[PDB]
Design a protein around this ligand. Structure first.
Ligand SMILES: [Zn+2]
Ligand SMILES: [Zn+2]
Ligand SMILES: [Zn+2]
Ligand SMILES: [Zn+2]
Lengths: 333, 358
């Protein structure tokens, strides 16, 4: 047997039912994990309507060479098949052969136990506390795919980050600076200014999302930034494109839920801007994200740890924007 | 000082040229007798045999280009003959065949050194705006803004290459990087840029799917190298492409129309596809949906202007036949007003050319 939180009917935050469930058994090329912590990012609130954890390896399944008992591991969000045309090409976030996503087709991490294939796990260094390790893939893990893999930030470039207050934002500020770039952060609240500074931001602009283009210009000596991390949800797109320098790059990341944004094709044309989608974290990207966390080059900002039984209270605090940071669910022993 | 006996330089005096002395209606264009320009250091004097009429010229004529100033000689799509060179013109001699770009480029800033001449800010002078255009028998041109016309290419066809096949090279190759085997979606394929893009894509070993508004514009696009053609105003072709592509989508899309077809273009893209945006005919804004760009990791690339190398290549493609030129009517220079009227009222399908008198 095994204790877990289950959702059988979409709707309200209180529908997350603590059902006693059976323990899963790993198949060929799979492993059983004892969940020590599991983060709640707003994508789960989206899944709570109709539209990220870490633990110890206790039982290894057949055809699992690299892994043993007691090994530390953290899970991605999207499973990725091995050898397709896009995987061998490095475009693992677009594979359709194995589109399995944790918390959906594969049992989520709201359980004391869970199984995961080999390719969907990243080794967690021994230095990492479990709470912080469970919030890496959807913060720093997304930062690696956005800042490095897709955006390809280079030392000597200036990066704009809209909606910089958040899991992906604060990790993108750190990583972009760690790779030798200057960081201009845009936030909506004065309170989030000091955090962005402590995270390494060279400039922090407080804007509702319709007036910062000029300030980003004055701060770049009229040149404009080379890269933009567009974290949708703040109504900032028009000002972002105007903040770009000629040939600048805009890497779009965020949730599907946010409405359509204001696009002026003229700006893209005459400035030859590159708007790039950035989606899923790769196993290699997660391994790097976990290292950068152990290293100290990219921190985590855990607001509070919550018992797994209180999963309904977690989604409520996250639904009403009554939290600043990333909450974690700890299953009982 | 500097006395000479050259009869040809002495004859170089006055010239015929369409002059615009007040921005406004097409009728403000009037042939006049102007003094010939003199080429200076790094410049070249051209004997214009033809100048393409680009709708850009219409906007310019109305005063909607801020840096243009009356009196003005319009036109940026000129093809002519080098009759005189100034000092520091090592690659250019009298008798050479040249065609002007749209705008200049300094060649020294980081952007220029990177091949991004379209984005140069230090020298953004346009032909027919800050410096005189091709609506005339002669014009001066910095060597940096000239492309070479093969001897096998007539003037009329050459005077319409920059703003069609020239743009196609920049869009399809330099920016789009279309590779043989990919499926290419082209909107507004029936236009000047579209027709050149269709040919250039089919020439690069790619399957071309054209989307035209005209119902009976298919016989040309098909003959132009298009494997598939779709008739649509721009709101219902997305599903038709997914049907003609076995539900896979397209690898790259050449968005010439812009806002009118953009939302459907995106939905028509395969995972990891890239949209190369070059035009926005209706000047309308777009409601971009982030989810489709993210989940599929799509790329939206802008393409602007043409470089000296791209025009040399575009001109070469027309002389060889890889990308034909569809010149409707050749019009005397003195009838520039009539040309704009035709172009404004959409009463023409193809490219118009102004031929200066001898
Ligand atoms: Zn997550
Ligand atoms: Zn795959
Ligand atoms: Zn330059
Ligand atoms: Zn033009």
């Amino acid at each position: 047997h095994m204790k877990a939180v289950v959702l059988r009917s979409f709707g309200e935050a209180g529908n997350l039912k603590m059902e006693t469930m059976p323990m899963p058994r790993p198949g060929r090329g799979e492993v059983l994990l004892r969940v020590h912590a599991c983060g709640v990012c707003y994508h789960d609130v989206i899944n709570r309507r109709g539209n990220e954890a870490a633990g110890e390896v206790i039982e290894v399944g057949p055809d699992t060479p690299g892994w043993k008992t007691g090994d530390r591991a953290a899970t991605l969000q999207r499973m990725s098949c091995g050898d397709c045309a896009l995987c061998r090409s490095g475009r693992n976030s677009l594979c359709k052969t194995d589109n399995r996503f944790f918390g959906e087709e594969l049992p989520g991490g709201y359980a004391q136990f869970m199984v995961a294939p080999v390719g969907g796990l990243g080794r967690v260094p021994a230095s990492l506390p479990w709470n912080e390790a469970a919030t890496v893939c959807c913060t720093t893990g997304t930062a690696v795919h956005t800042v490095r893999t897709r955006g390809k930030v280079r030392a000597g470039e200036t990066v704009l980050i809209t909606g910089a207050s958040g899991g992906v934002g604060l990790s993108s500020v750190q990583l972009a600076r760690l790779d030798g770039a200057r960081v201009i952060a845009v936030t909506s609240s004065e309170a989030k200014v000091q955090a962005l500074k402590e995270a390494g931001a060279d400039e922090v602009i407080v804007s509702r999302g319709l007036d910062f283009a000029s300030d980003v210009r004055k701060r770049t000596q009229g040149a404009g930034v080379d890269v933009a991390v567009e974290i949708v949800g703040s109504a900032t797109f028009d000002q972002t494109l105007k903040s770009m320098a000629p040939g600048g790059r805009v890497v779009v990341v965020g949730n599907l839920e946010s409405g359509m944004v204001q696009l002026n094709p003229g700006l893209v044309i005459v400035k030859e801007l590159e708007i790039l989608g950035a989606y899923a974290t790769t196993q290699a990207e997660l391994d790097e994200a976990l290292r950068l966390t152990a290293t100290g080059g990219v921190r985590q900002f855990v607001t509070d740890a919550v018992p797994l039984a209180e999963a309904a209270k977690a989604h409520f605090r996250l639904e009403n924007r009554e939290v600043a940071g990333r909450l974690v669910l700890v299953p009982p022993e």
